């Protein structure tokens with residue numbers, strides 16, 4: 001199994017929706033209701049909305065939107081925004097059957113390599129407090145909890 | 160997520176084949192070709208062979224064959240054989256998406272509970288040496304490597 005990381009493009013659109021869909025249903029099974037999850041996929045992962053985000057990510061050096069490809073098949077992605085020279089990790093999702101093999105770590109490491117060349121010295125993120133899978137992945141990659149906001153924990157890592 | 164463990168019945172055969180298929184295709188992906196793995200399902204997990212093993216389990220003879228059910232649907236199994244005073248753990252597999260939530264440990268421990276009642280003082284197993292997933296689970300549950308055989312490590316646990 002060979003993993004390549006690169007900028008997403010519009011040909012990745014349909015497979016990106018399926019990855020998201022599968023990851024959300026699996027990751028949030030004990031956490032959000034079925035309906036919440038389907039509304040979220042239908043709204044946040046519509047063709048039109050994602051297309052616009054993919055195109056934005058293409059021309060904007062302060063938006064990193066990368067896919068993980070396992071033998072040429074898209075199986076995960078990561079989204080980060082840089083504003084005032086600080087990073088926000090907005091999104092990181094793999095297909096469930098591709099978790100626990102450091103592909104997520106690889107996506108994070110590619111992002112941080114780009115942050116490093118830009119001079120970003122801080123990255124924040126929101127993770128749901130019951131998402132033990134995500135939350136523990138971040139604490140194992142140097143993120144610390146600084147605050148809570150509703151049902152999320154706010155985490156930060158310094159560079 | 161309500162997990163129930165109980166002996167397999169003939170009713171479970173069809174769903175047992177699909178769990179076997181999917182777990183095996185995932186577990187051995189980096190180790191054997193896709194085609195070889197499929198060939199196993201036709202042969203060792205033929206309808207008839209499995210039925211016979213399910214019935215012997217049901218009849219309380221040399222087979223112990225238990226399933227893990229998530230809200231009434233089969234998502235994993237454990238298969239052991241007893242000979243003389245010893246158990247051999249033949250098979251233990253979950254659907255990939257149901258891994259890493261202690262459902263495997265539940266199966267093992269339910270099996271061990273039935274083994275302690277039958278007086279069995281020793282369990283051995285053969286795990287492919289490149290199967291980190293299985294090997295690490297086993298060493299985290301008291302099993303130790305005693306030997307190798309072909310492509311496998313032989314592990315043992317004493318009661």
Ligand SMILES: CC(=O)SCCNC(=O)CCNC(=O)[C@H](O)C(C)(C)COP(=O)(O)OP(=O)(O)OC[C@H]1O[C@@H](n2cnc3c(N)ncnc32)[C@H](O)[C@@H]1OP(=O)(O)O
Nearest residue numbers: 027091092093094099100101102103104105134136137259
């Ligand atoms: C801002 C946000 O987007 S928050 C949402 C984060 N995304 C998710 O939770 C979606 C579902 N999960 C995933 O996509 C992935 O598991 C990620 C991205 C969170 C982590 O990537 P992975 O490549 O799976 O993790 P990686 O292999 O680098 O590290 C493994 C660690 O992550 C966690 N983890 C990864 N996969 C699993 C799994 N299947 N079951 C339980 N824990 C897991 C564990 O803490 C593990 O450490 P351990 O070995 O001590 O158990």
Ligand SMILES: CC(=O)SCCNC(=O)CCNC(=O)[C@H](O)C(C)(C)COP(=O)(O)OP(=O)(O)OC[C@H]1O[C@@H](n2cnc3c(N)ncnc32)[C@H](O)[C@@H]1OP(=O)(O)O
Nearest residue numbers: 100249250251252253258259260261262263264293295296
């Ligand atoms: C005798 C034989 O049949 S050998 C065949 C063994 N079976 C397999 O390898 C099939 C694929 N895997 C599975 O079906 C399951 O992972 C089992 C049956 C091996 C273990 O059951 P689970 O309920 O998943 O394990 P449980 O949650 O109790 O224990 C977790 C540990 O198992 C391992 N593990 C479980 N799931 C995963 C995963 N998705 N990725 C990597 N490691 C995993 C790790 O060692 C983990 O330890 P960690 O928390 O330090 O990472």
Ligand SMILES: [Br-]
Nearest residue numbers: 031032033036
């Ligand atoms: Br909800």
Ligand SMILES: [Cl-]
Nearest residue numbers: 020044090091
């Ligand atoms: Cl999202």
Ligand SMILES: [Cl-]
Nearest residue numbers: 129130150151
């Ligand atoms: Cl809480």
Ligand SMILES: [Cl-]
Nearest residue numbers: 288289307310
């Ligand atoms: Cl070796």
Ligand code: NI
Nearest residue numbers: 100136259295
């Ligand atoms: Ni783990």
